[PDB]
Amino acid sequence: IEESEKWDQRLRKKKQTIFSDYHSQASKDYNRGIRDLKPDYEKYDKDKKEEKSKSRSVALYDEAERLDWVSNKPDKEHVERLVESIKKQDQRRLKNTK
RNA sequence: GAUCUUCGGAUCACUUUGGUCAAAUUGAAACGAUACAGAGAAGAUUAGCAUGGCCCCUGCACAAGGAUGACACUGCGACAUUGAGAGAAAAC
Ligand SMILES: [K+]
Ligand SMILES: [Mg+2]
Ligand SMILES: [Mg+2]
């Protein structure tokens, strides 16, 4: 059944994936791009577990009056994958248009 | 110096310099000519009025003229891709 349920997910989206307006196109493009995302590397879990042991005050997930979220400077790999993803999307657009 | 005053002094008047810049090749403009093309509307000849502004010229002009003054008048991708097949690859 599990294989059929996987096919049920396929057919449900296949009839749901088959231009109307910009408002709906926004969400469709966004989650289509999300489908190509590969999250959850070794950075996030270490960040969650390490400074929480010495969390004297405020939480790492607290954002009511946090200040360090202004100065989040990412690493090389993340911005590299960003440029590569945007380049791939541009390639897809230019191969689709003509 | 003039006036008094009494030979102590008092009156009267009191600070310039119009500077596109020191006697003209090298800090007031704008070009002649020769050589090239060489006069708007989808055949041909040709009326014009406009639109745009780091383009102006003549004019006292918010008239009007200067070739309808001249130049300009186009053109592209917030396209989602799936619709499918095939050989591969890694995968139903
Ligand atoms: K004419
Ligand atoms: Mg005129
Ligand atoms: Mg004109």
The string of DSSP codes covering A20-39 is --HHHHHHHHHHHHHHT---
What is d(CA A66, CA A52) in angstroms, rounded to the nearest whole number? 15
Residue A86 CA and nucleotide B31 C1' are separated, in Å, by: 58
Experimental method: cryo-EM
CA A54, distance to chain mean position in Å, is: 30
> Which strand B nucleotides have any atom less than 7 A from protein CB atoms?
77-83, 92
Helix %, strand %, coil % of chain A (to 5): 65, 0, 35
Which string of DSSP letters, residue by residue, matches A65-87? S--GGGG----HHHHHHHHHHHH
CA distances from A88 to A36, A51, A81 (A): 11, 36, 10
Residue A74 and residue A81 in contact, taking contact as beta carbons nearer than 8 Å: no
Is there contact between A34 and strand B, defined as CB under 7 Å from any strand atom?
no
- Furthest C-alpha separation in chain A: 59
